[PDB]
Ligand binder design. Structure first.
Ligand SMILES: Nc1ncnc2c1ncn2[C@@H]1O[C@H](CSCC[C@H](N)C(=O)O)[C@@H](O)[C@H]1O
Ligand SMILES: Nc1ncnc2c1ncn2[C@@H]1O[C@H](CSCC[C@H](N)C(=O)O)[C@@H](O)[C@H]1O
Ligand SMILES: Cn1cncc1C[C@H](NC(=O)CCN)C(=O)O
Ligand SMILES: Cn1cncc1C[C@H](NC(=O)CCN)C(=O)O
Ligand SMILES: [Ca+2]
Ligand SMILES: [Ca+2]
Lengths: 347, 337
């Protein structure tokens, strides 16, 4: 039951990767169809339009190649031997499009500013509580749930902490497995994360511009590094109590069906005296989804729940600005005024 | 014609009437889910169901303000599309007619109004003989501000959501801040404090019936392409967050060029969030700003002002942990004489 539904989920994501080209091409063919239905005099006002559509198509083909490399990597895994054709949902295609942007955030020089706003404060808090002068960082155990493409877990590991990223989503697992285990040359790969955006373009070239990755070799972890990634629901995988020195969550807790469940887990699996570092907003992932449990709390209520569990609050900064896979050439942008806090389980 | 507009009219009246139902069902889902939690978890939040009740009261109040707009004008399940438009409408009240919306208005309307004063000064024009057209006037605040300067200004709006509201605010309203809405109660995510959700706004911040004497202000209902067909008529057309509503922006540009007088100016400020992009079966020509400028040039407009990266927001919740902004373009182009 567990293993079969995992198996179903698995090939569904695979199929979604395989379907990216068909989806996007149909979108561009809608556009070409409509453009050609215009009065011809209007089409001659834009004598480069059809050419630009052809450049998008090449971009789609290139993105599809990256996605097929990821699919090829995960099918032939040493530990994916346990798992063994339909059109993907529009929901999967959106997750796909989100995945490609995630490569900018986590593994491109283009996403350094965003990492500076979201990751530096977490890393800064870790160094504050486990200073190199008093702690062998190899003996400090740090769990990073919802690690995504894994850049933050990786950065912690670069300092020598015994860091383990966990992730539930096969979009994220397929991709991080590829970037972390196969990209051993800086900026060897390239993708087009903005071709999906047709609104709010200053220049048409803006939509077809590339980003390169990885800006950094993942295998430049120094010897003595202790870095790993796990696949599964972190509530089910990390059930052993009193284990972790530090749990670090970035844009994570608003992905729960019930964030109270998350807080209950973090309390049980922290070592007495350990800390929970959090940075992020409260965009509840299940808010709209029919037939899904979604408990949407204000930050005020989250703090009250944290306080009642017994945590003691060491750092609290509200209005920490950051973006999330922003396109800095776009005429429309979203930003977050995140909360950062460091709470501590009493010893 | 008459029969199909008849259908559109009552569909929107019905959406106005279904607002309380739609919102209460949303709250119902929350309450069922909270009550489904284990008792130990529920105890941790002893004001949650009380807070829900306060939301419901805000809901009920909003529904009263909506019914007032509909009787001042004069029950089936409306589409989520309508209800989103409805929620959008209540947010517009903040933008166009609340002290809270002043920051946005200064960002979006003041640069347009300054350009109007620049191109129609008293040393050259009798302001009351200058005809200015505001397509997509919304709740009409901008058009009103232009008419307040002594120009002959006509707002135009297609949506019945706006027309009901703009009528109610411009004709049936006198006393400042007499009325209040709860425009944020539908946002359950990204709240700092629970109390921000049930936070009230008041309108109108300024008295609409303070037009000076001889002022020439009017508002019309319908497709601005179909209503305005007299070529060489308008001294100025002012579009604010408007042109990206077109099925085909080239069509809007053609209408504007043709209905401006020789010497008339088109002022534009907004982004390019194309309204029909992600809608099935609807035509949608999504152009870059570069392409729109190439089209405008080929028509023969002379370009007088072009500012990119004009920062502004649109019905923003100042207290929310999530926020959008636009890097708009402002331009003024003249139809040559
Ligand atoms: N139950 C669960 N256990 C582990 N990860 C989960 C989870 N539910 C959702 N997630 C994942 O949590 C991730 C949050 S995205 C955040 C990624 C990264 N740390 C960053 O901030 O940039 C998503 O990739 C999502 O798939
Ligand atoms: N053909 C048309 N004629 C008149 N209004 C139209 C129209 N097409 C779209 N609209 C309207 O244009 C409006 C854009 S919102 C802009 C409102 C206001 N000027 C502001 O920026 O605050 C919408 O209310 C929409 O209903
Ligand atoms: C990951 N996460 C968890 N809480 C919030 C987020 C941000 C993310 N936001 C975007 O992708 C577009 C940004 N304007 C999302 O929607 O998942
Ligand atoms: C009116 N308009 C025309 N071009 C863009 C807009 C903005 C408007 N934006 C919102 O409502 C949410 C923004 N935070 C919309 O998309 O209707
Ligand atoms: Ca082009
Ligand atoms: Ca072609």
């Amino acid at each position: 039951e567990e293993e079969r539904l995992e198996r179903e989920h698995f090939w569904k994501i695979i199929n979604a990767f395989r379907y990216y080209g068909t989806s996007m091409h149909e979108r561009v063919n809608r556009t070409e169809r409509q453009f050609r239905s215009l009065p011809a005099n209007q089409q001659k006002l834009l004598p480069q339009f059809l050419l630009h559509l052809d450049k998008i198509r090449k971009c789609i083909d290139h993105n599809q190649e990256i996605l097929l490399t990821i699919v090829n990597d995960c099918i032939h895994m040493f530990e994916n031997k346990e798992y063994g054709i339909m059109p993907a949902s529009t929901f999967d295609m959106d997750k796909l499009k989100s995945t490609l942007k995630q490569f900018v955030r986590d593994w491109s020089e283009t996403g350094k500013a965003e990492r500076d706003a979201c990751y530096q404060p977490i890393i800064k808090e870790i160094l504050k509580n486990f200073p190199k002068e008093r702690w062998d960082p190899s003996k400090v155990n740090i769990l990073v749930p919802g690690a995504g493409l894994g850049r933050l877990a990786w950065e912690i590991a670069m300092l020598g902490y015994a860091c383990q990223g966990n992730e539930w989503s096969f979009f994220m697992l397929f991709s991080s497995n590829f970037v972390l285990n196969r990209c051993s040359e800086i900026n060897k790969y390239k993708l087009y994360p903005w071709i999906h955006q047709f609104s709010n373009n200053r220049r048409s070239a803006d939509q077809i511009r590339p980003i390169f990755f990885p800006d950094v070799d993942p295998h430049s972890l120094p010897p003595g590094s202790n870095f790993s990634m796990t696949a599964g629901d972190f509530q089910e995988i990390y059930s052993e109590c009193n284990t972790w020195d530090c749990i670090a969550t970035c844009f994570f807790i608003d992905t729960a069906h019930n964030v109270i469940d998350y807080i209950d887990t973090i309390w049980k699996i922290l070592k007495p005296g350990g800390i929970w570092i959090n940075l992020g907003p409260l965009l509840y992932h299940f808010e709209n989804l029919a037939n899904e449990l979604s408990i949407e709390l204000s930050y005020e209520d989250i703090k009250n729940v944290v306080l009642q569990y017994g945590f003691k609050v060491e750092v609290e900064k509200e209005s920490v600005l950051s973006t999330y896979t922003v396109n800095d050439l776009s005429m429309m942008k979203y930003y977050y005024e995140c909360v950062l806090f460091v709470v501590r389980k009493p010893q």
